[PDB]
Symmetry: C3
Subunit: 148 residues, 3 copies
């Protein structure tokens, strides 16, 4: 017989939220900001993308994003596709990703039950240009290849 | 025997054109702006990309973009490749895409003569950052996988 | 038997460096600016990406970028994968790429020892929006598909 391959692509952006002092109003103290895991998000998007399932939005807060990834792993099995490989590009002026990347790979390879060598995570910069260069936020691109 | 797979990638950007009142000059009324379907454009690019055909520019105005997509469908057949699947990411702060996405999928699946499940369209935002966050325009990323 | 496919994705950005007159300080003349091949860079990233090898950074200045591409060609052989095809999107408001693209394709197809038709290079614009629209720099997206 023959086999089937499918590509997904996720893209996500996270805006940094500056922490600023809590304020009192009408005598009550309100902590504020002025959550989302950008990579796992783009990754879920890529996988549902490859499957013609739309995005994470079609299927669904403060729960560890790892959970969602685990639900996507199940949806993946029900559709009877496997991961061939995953490639990730984190785009950030900062923080510095390099120290944490292998941890990310092990973490996700585990949840997804593939080999570390089947999921690549690299980080680049915009060279201080655009909203990412000004450190207003970060983005990630994910591509996945699925097989049956 | 064996089979062949090929990846394309399109990327397109559309700048919004503000509608502003018509002006008279030298006594003649001139309507102005201060056309392109961004998705079908990136999509054509991805397909010609996968085939080593360059871009839509290598092969060619106000004609419905669906037409071009139909010519790309023919070029695809002459090269004897088929679509495995297509993944699309629309990047926009607005308008709101969600209501129109299924229409897009049906429309394009039809022209391309594949299953709706073979073409995925998702929409994300830049979270109000960069030119897209300021609503100056929109972009789309397309990836396609082709087989023989 | 069966075969294996793998996707890579590279993304690179280059900031233009304005040439401005040399300055003298403490009586010594210092030439300054206020190097990297963006495409070959994203391309290497895509290939190492597909292989679960991280990025060019994991494996390594003023040497012709073609060299690095040639080392990536060797790493590719040691892992025993082949290029199915490569798709490149150069994002620039300028300079004008169109005249130089075929040269790029021949150059890289040669080093990589594949057919010109196996590597596609297209160029688009941001329509004068964002850092690329303001001509502050350029980016490239590469996707590659590898087989065994
Ligand atoms: Cl900007
Ligand atoms: Na799809
Ligand atoms: Na190609
Ligand atoms: Na990989």
């Amino acid at each position: 017989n023959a086999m089937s391959f499918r590509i997904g692509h996720g893209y996500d952006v996270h805006k940094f939220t500056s922490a600023k002092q809590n304020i009192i109003i009408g005598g009550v103290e309100i902590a504020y900001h002025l959550d989302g895991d950008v990579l796992i998000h783009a990754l879920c998007d890529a996988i549902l993308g490859a499957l013609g399932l739309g995005d994470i939005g079609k299927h669904f807060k403060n729960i560890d994003s790892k959970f969602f990834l685990a639900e996507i792993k199940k949806m993946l099995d029900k559709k009877q596709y496997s991961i061939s490989n995953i490639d990730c590009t984190i785009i950030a002026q900062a923080p510095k990703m390099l120290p944490h990347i292998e941890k990310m790979r092990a973490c996700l390879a585990n949840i997804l039950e593939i080999q570390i060598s089947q999921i690549n995570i690299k980080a680049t910069t915009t060279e201080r240009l655009g909203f990412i260069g000004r450190e207003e936020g970060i983005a990630t691109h994910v591509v996945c290849l699925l097989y049956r």
